[PDB]
Amino acid sequence: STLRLLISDSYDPWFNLAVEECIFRQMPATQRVLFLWRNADTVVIGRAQNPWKECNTRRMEEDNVRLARRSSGGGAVFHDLGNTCFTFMAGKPEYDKTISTSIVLNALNALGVSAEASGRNDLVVKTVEGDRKVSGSAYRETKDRGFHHGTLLLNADLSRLANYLNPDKKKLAAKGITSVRSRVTNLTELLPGITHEQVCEAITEAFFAHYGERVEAEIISPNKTPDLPNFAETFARQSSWEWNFGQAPAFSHLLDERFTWGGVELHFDVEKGHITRAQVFTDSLNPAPLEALAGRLQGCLYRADMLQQECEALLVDFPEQEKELRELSAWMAGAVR
Ligand SMILES: Nc1ncnc2c1ncn2[C@@H]1O[C@H](COP(=O)(O)OC(=O)CCCC[C@@H]2CCSS2)[C@@H](O)[C@H]1O
Ligand SMILES: [Mg+2]
């Protein structure tokens, strides 16, 4: 058989992306794979994105929404169980993302929805208010294979989608790919019945129809670690701060705050999630600990826990500025979250 059909029972984007990556690396040359999956509360960003610029990382952290960086290109999307994902993989030179797009459009047609491709990566439906995006796609290719993965909005919480994709206003000068915002809708507005299982079946049937074969589905469960080469290491990396946050392209952040005890402005340059240069400007009446902080920050992780550690470490040699340092510490954490 040339097909493989894989259905995930995990709702963890890190698990599901690691499965996708290991399956993809190990895929025989002649195989075509369909992988069908969902993620609970997640924002997934493209390989070259800056999370702090592209989504509300602070709100996500408060609400236990997971950040996942994927290996494909493109922008930032929100997943909950009302969102369904597909991945189609194939070897080159056969691989062509147009084929899998047409398979999804055929599945939607079979369910009674008329959609069409829009721009490079969207599927859109017509509504009384104008065209709405129900799907976003992204792609990855190597010398000898490709995959096309994308979403379908069935019954996603669109108020949460907006919330986590509306970042705090920050002075970030950031390299990387920026998201392209659209107006979206749920398929449930067109088909009130519609379920994840129904959509998975329709996509499955259209995949089988296109290729002229059927195969038995294989279920992948987080209850048994998948016996895929390098799974443990891939999963650990996919889960890590260093991958999801630290892989952001080089950027600068200009942070500033007025305190009762004076103004502080900080300029961080960040590369690979570390502060490679920090500069402090202040009119505090006791600037010494702030000057000490500026030198000590070089090499520090751009992350609240480590920044607060550096602020608070100054209490030993600057105990008279405890009030200032604790205010600075709490502010700075909130400013980089
Ligand atoms: N879940 C989802 N589905 C469709 N569109 C969405 C979704 N979430 C947000 N959006 C809208 O798309 C834009 C961003 O569009 P943009 O074109 O910038 O990015 C994409 O579409 C990326 C698709 C990635 C698909 C992968 C599938 C497996 S893991 S995630 C966002 O600002 C909203 O307007
Ligand atoms: Mg868009």
301 DSSP 8-state letter: B
Q: What is the CATH number of domain 1-248?
A: 3.30.930.10
H helix runs in the chain, sequence order: 13-26, 51-54, 57-63, 97-111, 158-164, 196-211, 231-239, 241-244, 288-296, 304-313, 322-336
* Dist. CA 18 → ligand 1 center (Å): 19
Residue 308's φ and ψ, nearest 5 degrees, are -70, -35
Question: Within the chain, which residue ranges are assigned CATH 3.30.390.50?
Answer: 249-337
User: Which atom of ligand 1 approaches the CA of 183 most closely?
Assistant: 34
Q: Is 145 helix (H, G, I), strand (E, B) or coil?
A: strand
Task: Give 114's contacts (C-beta < 8 A, 6+ positions apart).
Answer: 108, 125, 126
**Strand 122-125 to strand 145-153: parallel, antiparallel, or no bridges (unpaired)?**
unpaired
- Any atom of ligand 1 within 6 Å of the Cβ of 155: no
**Strand 83-91 to strand 32-37: parallel, antiparallel, or no bridges (unpaired)?**
antiparallel
Q: Residue 67 CB: number of other CB atoms within 10 A?
A: 22
Maximum distance among all Cα pairs of the chain, rounded to whole angstroms: 77
- Any atom of ligand 1 within 6 Å of the Cβ of 150: yes
Tell me how the structure was determined: X-ray
Question: Within the chain, which residue ranges are assigned CATH 3.30.930.10?
Answer: 1-248
Task: Give 271's contacts (C-beta < 8 A, 6+ positions apart).
Answer: 250
Sheet holding 262-271, edge to edge: 171-174, 251-259, 262-271, 274-282
- Binding-site annotation: residue ranges for ATP: 70, 75-78, 133
- CATH fold group of domain 249-337: Enolase-like; domain 1 (3.30.390)
Whose atoms come closest to the Cα of 55: which ligand?
1
Whose atoms come closest to the Cα of 80: which ligand?
1
CA atoms within 13 A on the CB side of 66: 20
**What are the DSSP calls for 74-140, one per residue?**
S--EEE-TTEEEEEEEEETTT--HHHHHHHHHHHHHHHT--EEEETTTEEEE--TTS-EEEEEEEEE
Task: Give 62's contacts (C-beta < 8 A, 6+ positions apart).
Answer: none
- Any atom of ligand 1 within 6 Å of the Cβ of 238: no
